[PDB]
């Protein structure tokens, strides 16, 4: 028995940020800045991907 495991995608972690310091400041602030306009998300917004 371990806890629940959250499956997390990092497609919206903003540019120029590492996953380490981005997760570090979300421990503290309980807020995580994201980017819904990353280049990895051009598919769903433009209607090209699901």
């Amino acid at each position: 028995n371990w806890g629940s495991i959250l499956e997390l995608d990092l497609s919206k972690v903003p540019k120029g940020w590492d996953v380490g310091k981005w997760m570090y400041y979300a421990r503290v602030n309980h807020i995580a800045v994201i980017d819904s306009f990353k280049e990895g998300t051009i598919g769903a917004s433009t209607g090209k991907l699901a």
């Binding site: 433009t46 209607g47 090209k48």
Partner: protein
């Protein structure tokens, strides 16, 4: 006889309106 400056511009305008219909059927579709 012959003079073709109004036969040209009417034929050039019919191919323009036919081209205009063809570019109005173009769709960049937006499902996945």
């Amino acid at each position: 006889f012959g003079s073709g400056a109004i036969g040209y511009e009417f034929d050039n305008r019919y191919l323009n309106n036919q081209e205009m219909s063809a570019v109005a059927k173009q769709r960049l579709t937006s499902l996945p």
